[PDB]
């Protein structure tokens, strides 16, 4: 919000150079003049014979402007032999990626071509250059001894780069190992030290690199993006990288340890071709000292409104937690074909509020696709998804869309002020723009009145207006303002006060000055520094008796204030800004002299009471809860009385009741901070006496883990009364947990069996199908469905195995569903390939681990009926009902407190056999 959008700096390279494709700050230790590094990957160069070799330019922000190209390399192509080129610098895109740390700056040519040392192959190895003291070295990590599509000849090393906090460069090349991709990291010191120009592949001690993997991982583009940050345990910066084509174009983000290439966590894209991984960023959004991962997926298509698909782009925000398991959230693009997550640049703390912040770019969004950058402030919770600022497009278009925001750099403060600044590159217009943060101001407004009360008989002060016995009071406002960073000393604010609120439209004005005879008043105030809260007093009087229509209403005195822009100072100019939310006005209120006695002052007796209906907690799955409340004041009128229901911090508020007509339809309010878990509802400033109110409040709640024993509500009324201004605290029991109805049921797919089967014969060694007969599947399913689960349970199946001397149903194979093991009796598998009541048992008991929150275990028993069995058996063909049965018992309810409920049930399945 405090980023100045009025007067940024605009830099430009030659036409067609894609000037702005890459940007970064340069912070040299020597000279006071800081610079900016702009990548111009297509720019024509002085390198002889090299066409569009590309370059990087350092740009001065302070005093004399424009830009000078950094000369890394003036050389053309070397020759392996006569008229036999060793390398190809033409269209090598030097400058596609530029990163700096302290005195060091790294720039890379990902399209850099290289002839083989033996064969004629010209391969896209990619190259980089590290400059530092004076000193320039060539760093060509992917240029190595194994060169081809299978090795790294296609790596295009330098496609993405980043420095670790320590001295070591992490570099991403997308093309290694059939575009599996590769990360390689090297100590910068090692690079400069061991570079020998007569050696085309230089041996580096302590270099870390991934290896070839199984061929499925081909074309996954590891190292498309890159970022550095500590995740595993502590210590060294560990490695983050986007692998956008991974998992059948689903995309992933791999994290490898900084010490070894062992990898710790993975993230994976939502749907294919969303290019999850296009951009990646690492920074601590919540200032919890745990780095948080951000992942751009600019091609994502969410679902809005009607349900129609739309590519908005999406950014992932993964908050690190000490447990090792992250806390991820999603952030969806606001416009179609914006490509929302295309660049994610941490800015650090732009407002110096104590939490780091970040800019996410949708370079193809906004009016005329001019490009937009959304800026989001960090908070204790995490990233605040409602963006505090949207930087819009500057340049419209020429040929390409400008892609404003296609590149960004932040967190490095380019000017003197204590706040970070941000560069966005728009290569489609060959431009780069520096946005500078303004210093932030937090003001603390004070207000106080001498007494609190209103009476015409309160007469005190005189007045030049007329003979005066009149009821006046003292009003004093005050401003203490401060902020970190450069604040130009003495800051002037124009404050304005109004004493009514229930007025000023016209008609009857309730409050007047004892000086300026006005409801309205201005004041040129001029505070300074961080201290010395500056105050100014004014005595204001009220209407007296007659001619006043008066009211019960307290008449709210409101004070507001604004900073002065035209009186402000800087080198060129920067107008400082107020705080984001530090409300720019305040309200107070007194009471009426009415009631209480003949005093205007009294002390009522406040009473609160409540009642439940049933109170059965769902164990935390979607449980509706309304409690009826009876609040009564047995004393006199309580001034500015309001209900404070203090509830457990995990629970949500549904709404006011508006159902039971004995309940209030009135004014309620949420408040989560000052560590308040309380809900606050307004009863009005002039509350009544002998009055009693009844209201219903519905909620919904989880109550995470093992806190189950009852539910506790605390509620209390509170007021501005001199004595007994608060009610006693009121408890409210709630009965903990509940039971559920779990049921088991089953079926046999051929529930019937018809007459004599064709092509049937019976012997005592008739292998498999013809003799065994047709397959009959019997699926049985036990399911826990309800707001409770079974931590342990017992299942007992009885299977009709044999009638008398013959095996009726022969079990071929058994199958399993869910967290359950089982064991049978009278073993099933034969030579390869009532009904059961009180009669020969084929019973199997099974032990299920848990059926949790609408979950179930299922046993599918497929059997064949044995012919032996199917012999006529004396009396001719009759109807048999083959019955199996399954019973259950639920074991170990969750909590000892409250009525743990016994659950019992059983099932039977039947197969009717007729001719």
């Amino acid at each position, epitope marked *: 919000f405090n980023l100045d959008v009025d007067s940024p700096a605009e830099y430009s390279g030659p036409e067609g150079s894609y000037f702005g494709f890459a940007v970064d700050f340069f912070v040299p230790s020597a000279s006071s003049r800081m610079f900016l590094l702009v990548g111009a990957p297509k720019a024509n160069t002085t390198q002889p014979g090299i066409v569009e070799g590309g370059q990087v330019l350092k740009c001065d922000w302070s005093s004399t402007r424009r830009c000078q190209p950094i000369e890394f390399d003036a050389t053309g192509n070397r020759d392996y032999a006569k008229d036999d080129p060793l390398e190809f610098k033409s269209h090598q895109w030097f400058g596609a990626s530029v990163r700096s740390k302290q005195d060091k700056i790294l720039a890379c040519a990902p399209l850099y071509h290289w002839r083989t040392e033996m064969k004629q192959e010209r391969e896209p190895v990619g190259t980089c250059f590290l400059q530092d003291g004076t000193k320039t070295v060539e760093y060509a990590p992917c240029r190595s001894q*194994d060169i081809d599509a*299978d090795g790294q000849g296609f790596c295009q090393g330098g496609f993405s780069i980043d420095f670790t906090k320590a001295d070591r460069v992490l570099l991403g090349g997308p093309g290694s190992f059939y575009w599996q991709g590769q990360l390689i990291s090297d100590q910068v010191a090692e690079i400069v030290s061991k570079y*020998d120009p007569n050696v085309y592949s230089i*041996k*580096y*001690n302590n270099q870390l*690199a991934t*290896r070839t993997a199984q061929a499925i991982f081909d074309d996954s583009y590891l190292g498309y993006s890159v970022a550095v940050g500590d995740f595993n345990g502590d210590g060294i910066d560990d490695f983050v990288s986007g692998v956008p084509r991974a998992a059948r174009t689903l995309g992933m983000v791999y994290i490898y340890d900084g010490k070894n290439m062992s990898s710790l966590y993975n993230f994976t894209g939502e749907q294919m071709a969303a290019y999850f991984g296009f951009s990646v960023a690492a920074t601590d959004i919540n200032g919890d000292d745990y780095a948080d991962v951000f992942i751009g997926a600019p091609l994502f298509m969410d679902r809005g409104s009607d349900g129609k698909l739309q590519e908005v782009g999406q950014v992932s925000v993964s908050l690190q937690r000490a447990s090792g398991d992250f806390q991820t959230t999603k952030l969806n693009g606001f416009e179609v074909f914006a490509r929302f997550g295309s660049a994610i640049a941490p800015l650090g703390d732009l407002d110096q509020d104590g939490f780091n912040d970040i800019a996410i770019a949708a370079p193809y969004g906004g009016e005329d696709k001019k490009g937009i950058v959304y800026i989001f402030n960090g908070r204790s919770t995490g990233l605040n998804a409602v963006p505090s600022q949207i930087l819009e497009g500057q340049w419209a278009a020429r040929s390409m869309p400008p892609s404003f925001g296609y590149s960004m750099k932040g967190a490095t403060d380019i000017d003197k002020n204590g706040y970070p600044d941000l560069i966005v590159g728009a290569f489609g217009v060959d431009r780069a723009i520096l946005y500078r943060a303004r210093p932030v101001i937090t003001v603390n407004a004070g207000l106080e009145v001498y007494p609190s009360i209103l009476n015409q008989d309160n007469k005190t002060c005189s007045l030049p207006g007329t003979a005066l016995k009149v009821s006046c009071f003292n009003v004093r406002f005050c401003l203490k303002a401060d902020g970190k960073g450069v604040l130009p000393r003495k800051l002037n604010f124009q404050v304005e006060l109004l004493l009514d609120k229930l007025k000023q439209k016209g008609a009857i004005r309730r409050a007047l000055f004892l000086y300026s005879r006005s409801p309205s008043h201005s004041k040129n105030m001029t505070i300074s520094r961080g201290g010395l809260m500056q105050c100014e007093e004014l005595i204001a009087y009220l209407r007296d008796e007659s001619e006043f229509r008066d009211k019960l209403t307290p008449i709210t005195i409101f004070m507001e204030y604004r900073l002065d822009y035209r009186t402000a100072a800087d080198t060129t100019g920067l107008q400082p800004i107020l705080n984001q939310f530090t409300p720019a006005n305040i309200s107070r209120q007194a009471h009426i002299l009415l009631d209480c006695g003949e005093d205007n002052v009294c002390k009522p007796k406040l009473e609160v009471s409540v009642d439940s209906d049933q109170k059965k907690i769902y164990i935390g799955d979607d449980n509706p809860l309304t409690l009826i409340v009876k609040a009564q004041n047995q004393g006199e009128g309580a001034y500015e009385a309001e209900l404070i229901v203090s509830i457990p911090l995990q629970a949500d508020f549904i709404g006011v009741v508006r159902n039971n007509e004995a309940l209030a339809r009135l004014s309620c309010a949420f408040k989560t901070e000052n560590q308040t878990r309380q809900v606050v509802c307004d009863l009005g400033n002039p509350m009544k006496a002998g009055t009693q109110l009844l209201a219903g409040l519905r909620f919904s709640v989880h109550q995470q883990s093992e806190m189950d024993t009852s539910v506790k509500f605390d509620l209390q009324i509170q007021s501005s009364n001199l004595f007994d201004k608060v009610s006693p605290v009121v408890s409210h029991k709630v009965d903990l947990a509940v039971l559920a109805a779990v049921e088991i049921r089953g079926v046999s797919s051929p529930d019937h069996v018809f007459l004599p089967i064709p092509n049937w014969e019976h012997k005592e060694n008739p292998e498999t199908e013809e003799d065994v007969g047709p397959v009959v599947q019997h699926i049985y399913e036990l399911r826990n469905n309800g707001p409770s689960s079974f931590s342990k349970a017992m299942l007992h199946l009885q299977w009709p195995y044999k009638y008398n001397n013959n095996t009726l149903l022969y079990i071929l194979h058994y199958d399993i569903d869910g967290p359950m093991n089982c064991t049978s009796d009278m073993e099933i598998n034969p030579l390869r390939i009532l009904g059961c009541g009180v009669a020969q048992c084929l019973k199997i008991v099974c032990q299920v681990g848990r059926l949790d929150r609408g979950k179930s275990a299922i046993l599918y028993v497929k059997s064949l009926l044995w012919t032996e069995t199917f012999m006529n058996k004396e009396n001719q063909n009759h109807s048999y009902s083959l019955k199996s049965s399954a019973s259950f018992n639920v074991i170990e309810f969750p909590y000892k407190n409250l009525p743990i409920e016994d659950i019992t049930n059983s099932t039977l399945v039947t197969t009717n056999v007729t001719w």
Partner: antibody
Amino acid sequence: QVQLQQSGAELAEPGASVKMSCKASGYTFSSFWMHWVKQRPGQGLEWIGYINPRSGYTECNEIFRDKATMTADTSSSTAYMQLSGLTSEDSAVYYCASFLGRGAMDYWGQGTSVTVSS
Amino acid sequence: DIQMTQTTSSLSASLGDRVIISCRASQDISNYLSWYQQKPDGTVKLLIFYTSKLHSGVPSRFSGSGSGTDYSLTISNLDQEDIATYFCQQGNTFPYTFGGGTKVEMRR
């Protein structure tokens, strides 16, 4: 700080197949070519062939063809040259060599003295 | 393959002398020639590559002279650790062809 740690002396009866080891410490092994050189006692240097780790591709010398069996363990950064059916003219100090650019093997091993006798 | 001939196999010299080690290729190898110093205990360190280049820690005393066939390792002022057996090796084409080596003999 590059060290090529070889196997110790290897005495083996004629016909047998010894297999020497070469540990590559101090640079990235799988990215560099591995040459082997044979020095017979009081004799000159006979190049045996090279092996590229990773890909595993190995081009031997034709005078040593069907003698030198070159393998490479990229998970331990260790080259291996097996010698099948070793005769007494295979008595020699064998040298693994890290291959630099151009025409030159940079940073060598200590040597393995294989001796075929009865 | 092209044979590498060093015609002088034992060069006697004092400390400080100028030692020009000649080595001729059979066929023109277009200047890929490595010079290796094998100390008497047998460890072989690389001194020069591509007809003249110093490799890292090798001192400036080893002048790389050569072109075409005729090549020559020109040792500057001699010292004790410079007493060893110097091989040339043709690296241009395949299979790599070494020389006979030239033993630097301290003079008494």
